[PDB]
Design an enzyme around this catalytic site. Structure first.
Site, PDB file in Angstrom:
ATOM      1  N   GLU A 100       0.841  -1.190   0.000  1.00  0.00           N
ATOM      2  CA  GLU A 100       0.000   0.000   0.000  1.00  0.00           C
ATOM      3  C   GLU A 100       0.875   1.237   0.000  1.00  0.00           C
ATOM      4  O   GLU A 100       1.881   1.280   0.717  1.00  0.00           O
ATOM      5  CB  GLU A 100      -0.881   0.014   1.249  1.00  0.00           C
ATOM      6  N   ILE A 171       1.642 -10.856 -11.427  1.00  0.00           N
ATOM      7  CA  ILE A 171       2.896 -10.974 -12.171  1.00  0.00           C
ATOM      8  C   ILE A 171       3.987 -11.286 -11.169  1.00  0.00           C
ATOM      9  O   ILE A 171       4.250 -10.497 -10.269  1.00  0.00           O
ATOM     10  CB  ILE A 171       3.247  -9.689 -12.984  1.00  0.00           C
ATOM     11  N   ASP A 207       2.880   7.313 -17.250  1.00  0.00           N
ATOM     12  CA  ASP A 207       3.721   7.315 -16.052  1.00  0.00           C
ATOM     13  C   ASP A 207       4.800   6.229 -16.118  1.00  0.00           C
ATOM     14  O   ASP A 207       5.065   5.514 -15.132  1.00  0.00           O
ATOM     15  CB  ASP A 207       2.853   7.177 -14.782  1.00  0.00           C
TER      16      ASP A 207
HETATM   17  N1  ATP Z   1      -0.505  -7.301 -11.521  1.00  0.00           N
HETATM   18  C1  ATP Z   1       0.447  -7.203 -10.554  1.00  0.00           C
HETATM   19  N2  ATP Z   1       1.322  -8.211 -10.281  1.00  0.00           N
HETATM   20  C2  ATP Z   1       2.281  -8.102  -9.335  1.00  0.00           C
HETATM   21  N3  ATP Z   1       2.480  -6.992  -8.598  1.00  0.00           N
HETATM   22  C3  ATP Z   1       1.671  -5.905  -8.792  1.00  0.00           C
HETATM   23  C4  ATP Z   1       0.621  -5.942  -9.811  1.00  0.00           C
HETATM   24  N4  ATP Z   1      -0.017  -4.745  -9.781  1.00  0.00           N
HETATM   25  C5  ATP Z   1       0.597  -4.001  -8.838  1.00  0.00           C
HETATM   26  N5  ATP Z   1       1.600  -4.697  -8.249  1.00  0.00           N
HETATM   27  C6  ATP Z   1       2.530  -4.205  -7.182  1.00  0.00           C
HETATM   28  O1  ATP Z   1       1.897  -3.126  -6.481  1.00  0.00           O
HETATM   29  C7  ATP Z   1       2.604  -1.899  -6.684  1.00  0.00           C
HETATM   30  C8  ATP Z   1       1.640  -0.740  -6.885  1.00  0.00           C
HETATM   31  O2  ATP Z   1       0.908  -0.987  -8.090  1.00  0.00           O
HETATM   32  P1  ATP Z   1       0.815   0.123  -9.231  1.00  0.00           P
HETATM   33  O3  ATP Z   1       2.170   0.701  -9.524  1.00  0.00           O
HETATM   34  O4  ATP Z   1       0.010  -0.479 -10.353  1.00  0.00           O
HETATM   35  O5  ATP Z   1      -0.202   1.256  -8.633  1.00  0.00           O
HETATM   36  P2  ATP Z   1       0.066   2.613  -7.754  1.00  0.00           P
HETATM   37  O6  ATP Z   1       1.094   3.461  -8.444  1.00  0.00           O
HETATM   38  O7  ATP Z   1       0.341   2.252  -6.326  1.00  0.00           O
HETATM   39  O8  ATP Z   1      -1.423   3.315  -7.825  1.00  0.00           O
HETATM   40  P3  ATP Z   1      -2.277   3.870  -9.110  1.00  0.00           P
HETATM   41  O9  ATP Z   1      -3.146   2.773  -9.608  1.00  0.00           O
HETATM   42  O10 ATP Z   1      -3.105   5.026  -8.564  1.00  0.00           O
HETATM   43  O11 ATP Z   1      -1.230   4.366 -10.102  1.00  0.00           O
HETATM   44  C9  ATP Z   1       3.438  -2.133  -7.929  1.00  0.00           C
HETATM   45  O12 ATP Z   1       4.616  -1.313  -7.983  1.00  0.00           O
HETATM   46  C10 ATP Z   1       3.745  -3.617  -7.889  1.00  0.00           C
HETATM   47  O13 ATP Z   1       4.946  -3.850  -7.136  1.00  0.00           O
HETATM   48 MN    MN Z   2       2.809   2.839  -9.887  1.00  0.00          MN
HETATM   49 MN    MN Z   3       0.731   5.153  -9.928  1.00  0.00          MN
END
Ligand code: ATP
Ligand code: MN
Ligand code: MN
EC number: 2.7.11.1
Length: 271
Positions: A100, A171, A207
């Site tokens: 988180e 993933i 991004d």
């Molecule tokens: N499909 C997935 N498989 C494995 N790990 C994931 C996956 N999606 C997200 N994560 C892990 O969670 C972290 C946060 O996810 P992500 O970067 O997609 O969103 P965020 O930047 O926290 O929020 P937002 O959706 O607002 O951009 C990622 O850096 C990754 O390490």
């Molecule tokens: Mn992200």
């Molecule tokens: Mn993000």
């Protein structure tokens, strides 16, 4: 509370009250009690009692300043969105929190149909006067639509979207930021080729960075699409240029890779 425990405390009237808030978010940030009551078909005194208890559980925020109204907290919106995923049969059990930050909470989950997945709950908007539920929901929907459009490319398979939640493939790979590679020029070129394929499908990531590319010995995946735009949308070209510039710069600083930013952009854009 933990999310699974919180879920188990919810009765059918609780879900009905949450439905009523959700369906009026487009009109009000704080949905008036009268509307919650009428939509849920629950008497106002009972409705108020349920909303008090939901506030105690940190699912809703109630305000009284101008009128008696209610909205979701992040936890509440996530819970409701999870409930929609469970009710649609796409998720069977929420599992452990993976991580988180300020933007999302990402949970492991299991689906009989989709296997062991992740569900990502959106905290923030990724959008006019330049100086929250509908914006978190818009982030989730945009990410879902981007992932759909990119299916068959090096992105997670996407399974469902409800509220602020996107259900997708787990993933097994770590952020590029954390992984030292011995063929950085090849890895950069693979990312740039994927950017080119996104562009061909009419999508700009928006991004692209060392935090949004996942890598293993197997290959690279690109994640995180709520800020993505369609080619043709205002500023799309400058946004694409930024993605290319940023990922090249990351590789420059980290590995001293020599890659001409202008040529890389021009190669992508020409076909
Ligand atoms: N499909 C997935 N498989 C494995 N790990 C994931 C996956 N999606 C997200 N994560 C892990 O969670 C972290 C946060 O996810 P992500 O970067 O997609 O969103 P965020 O930047 O926290 O929020 P937002 O959706 O607002 O951009 C990622 O850096 C990754 O390490
Ligand atoms: Mn992200
Ligand atoms: Mn993000």
């Amino acid at each position: 509370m933990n999310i699974a425990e919180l879920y188990g405390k919810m009765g059918k009237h609780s879900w009905r009250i949450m439905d009523a808030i959700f369906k009026n978010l487009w009109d009000y940030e704080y949905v008036p009690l009268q509307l919650i009551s009428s939509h849920a078909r629950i008497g106002e005194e009972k409705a108020r009692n349920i909303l008090k208890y939901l506030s105690d559980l940190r699912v809703v925020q109630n305000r009284q300043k101008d009128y008696e109204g209610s909205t979701f907290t992040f936890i509440g919106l996530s819970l409701y969105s999870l409930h929609r995923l469970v009710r649609s049969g796409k998720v069977d059990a929420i599992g452990k929190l993976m991580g988180e930050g300020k933007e999302s909470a990402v949970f492991n989950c299991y689906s009989e149909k989709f296997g062991e997945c992740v569900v990502k709950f959106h905290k923030v908007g990724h959008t006019k006067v330049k100086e929250f539920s509908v914006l978190a929901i818009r982030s989730a929907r945009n990410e879902f639509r981007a992932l759909q459009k990119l299916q068959g490319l090096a992105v997670p398979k996407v399974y469902a979207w409800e509220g602020n939640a996107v259900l997708m493939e787990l993933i097994d790979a770590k952020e590029l930021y954390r992984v030292r590679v011995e063929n950085p020029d090849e890895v950069l070129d693979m990312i740039l080729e994927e950017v080119a394929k996104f562009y061909h499908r009419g999508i700009v990531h928006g991004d692209l960075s060392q935090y949004n590319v996942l890598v293993s010995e197997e290959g690279i995946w690109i994640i995180d699409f709520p800020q993505s735009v369609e080619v043709g949308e205002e500023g799309w070209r400058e946004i694409l240029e930024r993605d290319v510039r940023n990922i090249i710069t990351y590789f420059s600083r980290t590995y001293r890779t020599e890659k001409d930013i202008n040529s890389a952009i021009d190669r992508i854009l020409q076909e």
